[PDB]
Amino acid sequence: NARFQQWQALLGNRNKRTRAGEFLVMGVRPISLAVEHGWPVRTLLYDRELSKWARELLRTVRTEQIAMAPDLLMPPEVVAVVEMPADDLDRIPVREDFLGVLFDRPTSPGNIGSIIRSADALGAHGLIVAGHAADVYDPKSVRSSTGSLFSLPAVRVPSPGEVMDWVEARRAAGTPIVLVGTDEHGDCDVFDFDFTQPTLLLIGNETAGLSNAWRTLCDYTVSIPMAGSASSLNAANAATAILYEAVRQRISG
Amino acid sequence: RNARFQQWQALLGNRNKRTRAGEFLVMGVRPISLAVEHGWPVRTLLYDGQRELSKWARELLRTVRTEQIAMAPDLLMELGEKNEAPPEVVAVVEMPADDLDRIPVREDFLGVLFDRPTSPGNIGSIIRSADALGAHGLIVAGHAADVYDPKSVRSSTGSLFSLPAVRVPSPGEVMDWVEARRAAGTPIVLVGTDEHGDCDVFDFDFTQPTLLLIGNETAGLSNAWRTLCDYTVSIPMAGSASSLNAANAATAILYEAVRQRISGR
Ligand SMILES: C[S@@+](CC[C@H](N)C(=O)[O-])C[C@H]1O[C@@H](n2cnc3c(N)ncnc32)[C@H](O)[C@@H]1O
Ligand SMILES: C[S@@+](CC[C@H](N)C(=O)[O-])C[C@H]1O[C@@H](n2cnc3c(N)ncnc32)[C@H](O)[C@@H]1O
């Protein structure tokens, strides 16, 4: 095996993932979402069982198709090498009902995936991973997104200044996006805020909150009421709940 | 190394071992602190023997009245994340009995049942959200993922020590306990959760005493629990495509209960 070892390097460290511009995706369901949403598939790896769905995948996705022994597939029956898109902020569409999420400096890839799943499911339009972060294309992120990665554009952006240039430009085409930070001890209960406006929701780190550079640029900062001093919420759970509040207002009136 | 060491190491694997020994491992100065604060008996306190020893570790050692063993750093990498964080202290904590009476039941009861979880991390996450949003207890049904799995404990971020969590094999024991609470004067309603549920979560009355049922990641709620439900509720979704992780869903709905209870809207 040789080109196999290039595929194995994509599981481990993100340096090699970035240079090749591609990543691993497993499961008939995730791959089909990738095909359906226009993501390129350079290679398609497959085990003797084979499902009805996996079979239909082979005779429909017209790309390089390679058989593998059960041994080497590490427990999945299909794996795809998928073309990683460019990190363009215009992949996120901005309309009058904008609802987006920024995740500030996350250390948990699992948490990124979770946010994508939740933002996809609750009708948000895009996610931004800002700053020195764990990789959107890390397998823990791909897995826990559950295929939402392909329907909900996640864009990676090292500088917070580049996010502000895009936001200000969206503002210039009449779309009054408000930045809404989130925090345990904020100035405004989450259910008192008007989520019917175009909204970019800023979600903080697991150990630090939001950076202080993001708290300054926030128009408003909202909080979910908590039972006590000792308690707080995980990033993905908290963000799910706020996104849900937004949907509720938008549906309620 | 030691035969003592091998018994503690075996507390990382299957659930039956921890149950029969009546103990589990708590890793880190902070979660061990919350165990001592909320009164969990500590049987043994292990620590680094070629010592960095921080102030916090040192305060634990001289404050907790228990057996105290210096251990070599290598041994102490029993579990952390074989990648993230060797702990300088690890406690052997006593596991409480699986008695539902540990969950207090009042007129404004709010409880959660998690039905045969596949993933232990999800349990701890629910423990942490239920704790933080004012739920009064967690029940975990089945012999799947275990409340006292290291991933569950780690994931609860200490909340395991303040929010009572009880394991039950099957619905039967839970129903005996619910009917008993109803007879004593608290009309607990069983509320199942499902993407295709009978009514929207914000159209349901969460001010009433509630046991909220959260299903598992790949199967949802079992058919036995759907049959026992007084009602089913749903977070509306964007399409027929995505769905929600169980802890995330449970957090959204616990939050909804909290919102209604801040009396009104
Ligand atoms: C574990 S908290 C961060 C810890 C906290 N900022 C600190 O000073 O230690 C992770 C993230 O989830 C969100 N979060 C957690 N609990 C929240 C709450 N009660 N209200 C609003 N956001 C919350 C926030 O966005 C926060 O940045
Ligand atoms: C991944 S979901 C269940 C999966 C589903 N039965 C399936 O077809 O695979 C895990 C649990 O989270 C909760 N949940 C997820 N999405 C929900 C939603 N939209 N409304 C209410 N509960 C939801 C439910 O308790 C559910 O059982």
UniProtKB/Swiss-Prot annotation, chain A:
<dbReference type="GO" id="GO:0008650">
    <property type="term" value="F:rRNA (uridine-2'-O-)-methyltransferase activity"/>
</dbReference>
<dbReference type="InterPro" id="IPR001537">
    <property type="entry name" value="SpoU_MeTrfase"/>
</dbReference>
<dbReference type="GO" id="GO:0031167">
    <property type="term" value="P:rRNA methylation"/>
</dbReference>
<comment type="function">
    <text>Specifically methylates the 2'-O-ribose position of uridine-2479 in 23S ribosomal RNA. Confers resistance to antibiotic avilamycin, an orthosomycin antibiotic.</text>
</comment>
<dbReference type="GO" id="GO:0003723">
    <property type="term" value="F:RNA binding"/>
</dbReference>
<dbReference type="InterPro" id="IPR054578">
    <property type="entry name" value="SpoU_sub_bind-like_N"/>
</dbReference>
<comment type="subunit">
    <text>Homodimer.</text>
</comment>
<dbReference type="Pfam" id="PF00588">
    <property type="entry name" value="SpoU_methylase"/>
</dbReference>
<dbReference type="GO" id="GO:0032259">
    <property type="term" value="P:methylation"/>
</dbReference>
<dbReference type="InterPro" id="IPR029026">
    <property type="entry name" value="tRNA_m1G_MTases_N"/>
</dbReference>
<dbReference type="InterPro" id="IPR029064">
    <property type="entry name" value="Ribosomal_eL30-like_sf"/>
</dbReference>
<dbReference type="InterPro" id="IPR051259">
    <property type="entry name" value="rRNA_Methyltransferase"/>
</dbReference>
<feature type="binding site">
    <location>
        <begin position="224"/>
        <end position="226"/>
    </location>
    <ligand>
        <name>S-adenosyl-L-methionine</name>
    </ligand>
</feature>
<feature type="binding site">
    <location>
        <position position="204"/>
    </location>
    <ligand>
        <name>S-adenosyl-L-methionine</name>
    </ligand>
</feature>
<keyword id="KW-0489">Methyltransferase</keyword>
<dbReference type="Pfam" id="PF22655">
    <property type="entry name" value="SpoU_sub_bind_like"/>
</dbReference>
<protein>
    <recommendedName>
        <fullName>23S rRNA (uridine(2479)-2'-O)-methyltransferase</fullName>
        <ecNumber>2.1.1.208</ecNumber>
    </recommendedName>
</protein>
<dbReference type="InterPro" id="IPR029028">
    <property type="entry name" value="Alpha/beta_knot_MTases"/>
</dbReference>
<keyword id="KW-0046">Antibiotic resistance</keyword>
<keyword id="KW-0949">S-adenosyl-L-methionine</keyword>
<keyword id="KW-0808">Transferase</keyword>
<comment type="similarity">
    <text>Belongs to the class IV-like SAM-binding methyltransferase superfamily. RNA methyltransferase TsnR/AvirB family.</text>
</comment>
From Swiss-Prot, chain B:
<keyword id="KW-0489">Methyltransferase</keyword>
<comment type="function">
    <text>Specifically methylates the 2'-O-ribose position of uridine-2479 in 23S ribosomal RNA. Confers resistance to antibiotic avilamycin, an orthosomycin antibiotic.</text>
</comment>
<protein>
    <recommendedName>
        <fullName>23S rRNA (uridine(2479)-2'-O)-methyltransferase</fullName>
        <ecNumber>2.1.1.208</ecNumber>
    </recommendedName>
</protein>
<feature type="binding site">
    <location>
        <begin position="193"/>
        <end position="194"/>
    </location>
    <ligand>
        <name>S-adenosyl-L-methionine</name>
    </ligand>
</feature>
<dbReference type="InterPro" id="IPR029026">
    <property type="entry name" value="tRNA_m1G_MTases_N"/>
</dbReference>
<dbReference type="InterPro" id="IPR029028">
    <property type="entry name" value="Alpha/beta_knot_MTases"/>
</dbReference>
<dbReference type="GO" id="GO:0008650">
    <property type="term" value="F:rRNA (uridine-2'-O-)-methyltransferase activity"/>
</dbReference>
<dbReference type="InterPro" id="IPR001537">
    <property type="entry name" value="SpoU_MeTrfase"/>
</dbReference>
<dbReference type="GO" id="GO:0003723">
    <property type="term" value="F:RNA binding"/>
</dbReference>
<dbReference type="GO" id="GO:0031167">
    <property type="term" value="P:rRNA methylation"/>
</dbReference>
<keyword id="KW-0046">Antibiotic resistance</keyword>
<dbReference type="InterPro" id="IPR029064">
    <property type="entry name" value="Ribosomal_eL30-like_sf"/>
</dbReference>
<feature type="binding site">
    <location>
        <position position="215"/>
    </location>
    <ligand>
        <name>S-adenosyl-L-methionine</name>
    </ligand>
</feature>
<comment type="subunit">
    <text>Homodimer.</text>
</comment>
<dbReference type="GO" id="GO:0046677">
    <property type="term" value="P:response to antibiotic"/>
</dbReference>
<dbReference type="InterPro" id="IPR051259">
    <property type="entry name" value="rRNA_Methyltransferase"/>
</dbReference>
<dbReference type="GO" id="GO:0032259">
    <property type="term" value="P:methylation"/>
</dbReference>
<keyword id="KW-0808">Transferase</keyword>
<dbReference type="Pfam" id="PF22655">
    <property type="entry name" value="SpoU_sub_bind_like"/>
</dbReference>
<feature type="binding site">
    <location>
        <begin position="235"/>
        <end position="237"/>
    </location>
    <ligand>
        <name>S-adenosyl-L-methionine</name>
    </ligand>
</feature>
<comment type="similarity">
    <text>Belongs to the class IV-like SAM-binding methyltransferase superfamily. RNA methyltransferase TsnR/AvirB family.</text>
</comment>
<keyword id="KW-0949">S-adenosyl-L-methionine</keyword>
